[PDB]
Amino acid sequence: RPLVALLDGRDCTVEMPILKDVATVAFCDAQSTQEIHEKVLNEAVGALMYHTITLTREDLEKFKALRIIVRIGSGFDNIDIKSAGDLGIAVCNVPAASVEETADSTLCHILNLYRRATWLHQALREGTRVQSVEQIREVASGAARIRGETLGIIGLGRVGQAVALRAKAFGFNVLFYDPYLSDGVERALGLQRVSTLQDLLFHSDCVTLHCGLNEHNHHLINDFTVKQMRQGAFLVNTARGGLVDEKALAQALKEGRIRGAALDVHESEPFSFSQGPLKDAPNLICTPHAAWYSEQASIEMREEAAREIRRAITGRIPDSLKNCVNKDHLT
Amino acid sequence: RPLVALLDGRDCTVEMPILKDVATVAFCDAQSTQEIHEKVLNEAVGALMYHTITLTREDLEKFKALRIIVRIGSGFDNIDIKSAGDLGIAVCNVPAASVEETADSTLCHILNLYRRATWLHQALREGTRVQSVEQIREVASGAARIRGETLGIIGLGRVGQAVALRAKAFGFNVLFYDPYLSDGVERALGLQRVSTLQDLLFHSDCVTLHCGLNEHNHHLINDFTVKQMRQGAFLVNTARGGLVDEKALAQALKEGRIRGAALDVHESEPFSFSQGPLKDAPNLICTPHAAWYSEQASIEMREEAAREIRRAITGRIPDSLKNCVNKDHLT
Amino acid sequence: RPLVALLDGRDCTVEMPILKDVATVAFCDAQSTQEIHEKVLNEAVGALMYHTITLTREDLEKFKALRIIVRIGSGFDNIDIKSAGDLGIAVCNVPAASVEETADSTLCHILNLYRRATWLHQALREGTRVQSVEQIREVASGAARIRGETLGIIGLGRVGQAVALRAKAFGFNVLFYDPYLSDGVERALGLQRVSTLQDLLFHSDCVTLHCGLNEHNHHLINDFTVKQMRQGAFLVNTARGGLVDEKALAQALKEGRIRGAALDVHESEPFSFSQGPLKDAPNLICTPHAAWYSEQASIEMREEAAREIRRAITGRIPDSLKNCVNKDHLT
Amino acid sequence: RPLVALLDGRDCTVEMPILKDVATVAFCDAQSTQEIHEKVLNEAVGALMYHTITLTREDLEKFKALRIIVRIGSGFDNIDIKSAGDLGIAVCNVPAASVEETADSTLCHILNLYRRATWLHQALREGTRVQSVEQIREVASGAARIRGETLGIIGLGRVGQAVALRAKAFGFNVLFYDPYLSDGVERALGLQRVSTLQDLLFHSDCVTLHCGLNEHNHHLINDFTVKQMRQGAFLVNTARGGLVDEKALAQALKEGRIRGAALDVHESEPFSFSQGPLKDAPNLICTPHAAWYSEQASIEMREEAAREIRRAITGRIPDSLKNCVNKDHLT
Amino acid sequence: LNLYRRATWLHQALREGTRVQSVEQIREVASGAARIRGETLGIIGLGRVGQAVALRAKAFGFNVLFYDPYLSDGVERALGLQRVSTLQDLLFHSDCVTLHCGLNEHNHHLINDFTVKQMRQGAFLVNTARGGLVDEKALAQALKEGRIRGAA
Amino acid sequence: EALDLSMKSVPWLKAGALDLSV
Amino acid sequence: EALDLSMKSVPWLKAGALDLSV
Amino acid sequence: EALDLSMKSVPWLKAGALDLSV
Amino acid sequence: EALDLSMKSVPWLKAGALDLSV
């Protein structure tokens, strides 16, 4: 009876009934690579991990019997894919279980910036009282009309396509930029495509990020590029925290070149309003990295990951795997 | 030159350049019918008013030269229409200047209830810290999946039709109830229609109010009807404050029969969290009656109202008026 | 029991089981007012009629016991509404039973003009043989690209609204003209509105008629107005035959000012290609007035008309009637 | 100056101004591989060809200086891709120039089957006269209601996605089958996906083919599979002629198991109604393989193909090529 | 009933010495039990035994389908059942499959490797007719991977 | 459009509406 | 909400509507 | 987040995964 | 499909591609 370990977690009520007659389940509840028990490093066949722990090549070499790693989610930028292939370890993930949940959360943030609703609710709890019409025009100053505006999207993937369809019902004009796609994808969906990142920033009133975090796009929104945006634009980020330089973003908000920004992922987590470069920056909305959670979505992704482990144990690698991301590098 | 008075206001920078060579403009900045200057009650031909002041039959009889009243907005439930017709006073309004602004604000409130975003942002400012995945599932507990749900609409008017079109892009199933419409309106838009209010409440997971406040629907959501809704439903109100009994709503929130409620208009205004029947009620979102404001919308409605006055002075009543609501009662 | 007569028809298999225990059913199969039996003119309480027979004031005076007329369909321009009110006769109809059938047929005609499909199929049956690519470009010469074009609609009713929603999915730009509607109807649907008929014709590449045939719009597309259209436009008519002057249309097709025309209703019926002003006119598509027929639609409209008669006999007029069109004129 | 030859064509008015200062242009107007001039087989560097000529391995070996083949269109099933790679010949095509033209033509055929329009127009030209309502119900017998039906799509590519979006506006229910796609593609577009071809045929009322003609799907709709469809279904084919067995289709139409069929491509071309297995088959609509033609589309695809040749001559193969389909097989 | 309401396995566990005291332990040893009402039952071959099983299964709330190519028309009308026309369609919409046919020369290894992959995720299988209708080599692999929850 | 080959055109069946066509 | 630090509150500018507030 | 008032913290219930937390 | 009534079929105009048709 092999051993399967959950690296960062404590609850295993869903995976246990599946992997009970083929393996032995255990958890570590670790927060770093130095908090892994010695028994795991010697007698582990498979592992399950969330986004809260990062594994490097040195960490991978400490395992002596690992054969497969399954990531519960869609992102795998916290695992060294190429290094694991050389050592003979397969990496899997759940590609699409929260596509629609993330798309709905992106639209919610966009509407909050135009039709100010979170800020108005926050003002009432602080004790602000508004009675006359002139007071109403002042507290809610800054709202705009959605129809006629231009929306820019960086990366037209599963989530990117879902956002584009919903944005057209409100009257937006949609552009996108993606250098890894084929020709004619925009013809099917009736969108407009640009060829350079600079051209997208020149003609956009709201920018949303939906790309992946590879090694060629770290700090994509840096100091130089943030000065190419329009006067008084918005910014929404729900993909990854490493795509935006928070130090340069804070200066833009203070000077007024950017009207507002809604963020769901940050460079350093967990996030606190009293620490970091964004300690005192006006017009900011933040959420604790929960743009994927749902009652149905949580159960679906946990069951799929458990069944991927069972096929690997009672089959062959990587012939029996459905979602393998390091097949080319695997030897 | 005749005299035109703004009953409740102080700013007249937009109306002044229009009505400068045909009349004399003045303002009162009154909050009640007892704060109107004596000169206005004797030498006023027209008047402009917002929603913050109510006029009854006794108040109307005090005017000696009034001939026309123009309401800056779409609602006129605060003016006795029938009584003004007998005295020989015409009432006008601006029918559609903020149709799309109100429709966008309604969708923003719906998304906040499903994908909890205002509550998550509020928690971070209070100092809550979440690091592990188990903590994330607890703070954001209650989020649901939009696709497959049923949306119920009461009153299919200008705003009601706009909301229905936008709700179909997210996967909602739309029903509506309206007893004053003709046959086949749902065929054109591809919707579903019911015949009784009770049937709508039985098969709805989210209820939105978009009707008008006449004398046959005061306290439409009363104590008896609130018990006919499903277990764990939502409620959104952005039309008028007199359609909902706040005393009965508070009890439902505490017992848990209603999961949440978003309100933009209340029975007593201005609204304060420390006063009223809703002093301590969980899962509540409130805004200070600002679902109509926009930079473009504000200018458009003020210019249209000013030009309606000029046509009446330099024309004939009610032949020259475009939007008259008491033409039948006028003698 | 009273007598109910079907003026123009022979089949009564659907109405008979409903009106069997309250009245006596009979049919006349008449083609003109002079072919009605003498017994009907003296002992008839109600009548049912299609669009193939026209009744004038002189014809109505010949009836001695008629009390109600029910029209199976949505149009009632073949009955003198005002004259029947003076004599004390109520007129009813079925407002919406084939809204979606007519909207789908309108879209089919539009696509045939752009993507030539009926003409290509007709050519093959005549024996035309095409092998090389150059031959293909010649037989199908004239096809255009739909996206970017402008569509003009005259009359935004039940059918007009259905067509507008379907046309936006193909990339059309939609305008409409309607002088009897209120303000802000275009805001809800996100369309564009013009104020004059001449302005609509100047900026349209395809014109569709969806209005009613009252006494102020006979021969709406006359000789003078047909010269205000663009060079090489289309024309679709599916509402009524009296709205278009066929003599002026034929000259436009020959000279080339109009690229094509699809017609479903004509001034003189039945239609034949060998007779009339359109005997020899290129680029013409005609159908035998069957844009409403469907298996489900036919049964639905016949049952509704039968039940309207039963309510009138066993009730009071016009309190028990649901769809009455001459209530104001009724005395 | 090298020589470039157009294998099947006579008109070169568009390619000549581009390839005039870098090569020599010539045409052959050939209908078979045996009609190619001897000079071409010895002194040709590049070639342009339509879909009317087929090249095999034996034909390719006869060329002594060919280096690149450019196909004007999107399909390349008439060229042996693998064999050309071994000999050192690159194959290119134009991926997306008529995506929207083909999607519009597919929708036109679907509407003709439900709302019979081509057949009604054909009947009038034959001299049929219809006057009464009973005659109308008989000539147009078979029309159905679109809303509530199920549409099945085989192959979700560029054209397949375009058709799905337009079909939802009419009330269709859309399913698709594609075994070469990743997971979650249906989540973005909000569609439904099946896993087997048999399951798609069981629950479909209209079947459309949009896949490619590889070596694993020849005669996909064979005798055995045609008996698994529902009683009284439709069939639309606009992709390729080799996917349907015409001998088995003819028997189904006669017995009545298939209500109708619209075809744009056939096994043997050119098509004639007096020859072939479909000589006498009721309820048939055919077009002469012209679902791609448009005034704008024709010019766009010819210019792109010409510029692909120029880059190859003044660059390196296959580094300078944008759309290469045999890069893996190229040595 | 043994597959849904696990009873043989629970009795076997007690004899091996397993001890369960708390409620959490009870939920773990008996994990996998389901609710019978609302499920679909598929029958292959409606003979003497097949008809007897169908009548008893309706009292528990099952939904019954059957497949038989050698019967006449209207047999399902008398018993109020539902009939399909192909074997593949029966496997797609069934949560429990029972075999009641005969072993002729046209149905040897009816449940082979290819057909066992057309069943639903987590279905049951009961065989009491003949041994030659099921390929045991392919059945063993399905149980290990988890595509079939159990088999009697 | 069914062809009426009712040779023995008798009237032993009064089954429907009253025919009042002229 | 601009703070009114108009110390020398004189009336050398009659620039707008007539103020009739009570 | 349930408060653990398990005063008599005994081990008469081995009901789940093996805890290997450090 | 233009009818070629080029009676005096001379060759004083070499205006385009090289015709290599067999």
Ligand SMILES: NC(=O)c1ccc[n+]([C@@H]2O[C@H](COP(=O)([O-])OP(=O)(O)OC[C@H]3O[C@@H](n4cnc5c(N)ncnc54)[C@H](O)[C@@H]3O)[C@@H](O)[C@H]2O)c1
């Ligand atoms: N709760 C959350 O915050 C949450 C949940 C799910 C996914 N995500 C993140 O969303 C992102 C997108 O997910 P997906 O499912 O749409 O991914 P996907 O892999 O399906 O598509 C990603 C797209 O990004 C494009 N891309 C890559 N590099 C690019 C670049 N430099 N510039 C522009 N485009 C580029 C790719 O070509 C592809 O089209 C991922 O980073 C994922 O981790 C976040």
Ligand SMILES: NC(=O)c1ccc[n+]([C@@H]2O[C@H](COP(=O)([O-])OP(=O)(O)OC[C@H]3O[C@@H](n4cnc5c(N)ncnc54)[C@H](O)[C@@H]3O)[C@@H](O)[C@H]2O)c1
């Ligand atoms: N900022 C704000 O809060 C704001 C802004 C604009 C409008 N509004 C309110 O929105 C409401 C709707 O505006 P509109 O422009 O759509 O109005 P409208 O007059 O165009 O349409 C109102 C609809 O309500 C229907 N209705 C009336 N009584 C009903 C009843 N008892 N039950 C069901 N339906 C009933 C009518 O038949 C009609 O279809 C009004 O009350 C208006 O004052 C609020």
Ligand SMILES: NC(=O)c1ccc[n+]([C@@H]2O[C@H](COP(=O)([O-])OP(=O)(O)OC[C@H]3O[C@@H](n4cnc5c(N)ncnc54)[C@H](O)[C@@H]3O)[C@@H](O)[C@H]2O)c1
């Ligand atoms: N098979 C058929 O050919 C068929 C079937 C059904 C209906 N119809 C015809 O379709 C037409 C429209 O039907 P509907 O249900 O949409 O009608 P409706 O009464 O619901 O709407 C008609 C619209 O026409 C507008 N209108 C009237 N006069 C106008 C004018 N001069 N210019 C512009 N607009 C004008 C009205 O204001 C209204 O908006 C009718 O004439 C009807 O008889 C034809």
Ligand SMILES: NC(=O)c1ccc[n+]([C@@H]2O[C@H](COP(=O)([O-])OP(=O)(O)OC[C@H]3O[C@@H](n4cnc5c(N)ncnc54)[C@H](O)[C@@H]3O)[C@@H](O)[C@H]2O)c1
């Ligand atoms: N005028 C015309 O008739 C015309 C014009 C253009 C294209 N076409 C034809 O249309 C077809 C589709 O073009 P496209 O641009 O959408 O192609 P594409 O290459 O972009 O997409 C083709 C799709 O077919 C799928 N597919 C392949 N084999 C399949 C199978 N056995 N079963 C199901 N799906 C399968 C692929 O995975 C892919 O999703 C091609 O055959 C093309 O030649 C015809």
Ligand SMILES: NC(=O)c1ccc[n+]([C@@H]2O[C@H](COP(=O)([O-])OP(=O)(O)OC[C@H]3O[C@@H](n4cnc5c(N)ncnc54)[C@H](O)[C@@H]3O)[C@@H](O)[C@H]2O)c1
């Ligand atoms: N103790 C035991 O294990 C035991 C006891 C008695 C009977 N049996 C077995 O039970 C089976 C059924 O007995 P019965 O009395 O009901 O038989 P029966 O002969 O009365 O009925 C058999 C049915 O199977 C159907 N059938 C045949 N081939 C089929 C196929 N390929 N697909 C679907 N249906 C098919 C027949 O048409 C018929 O309806 C027999 O194989 C019998 O030997 C086993």
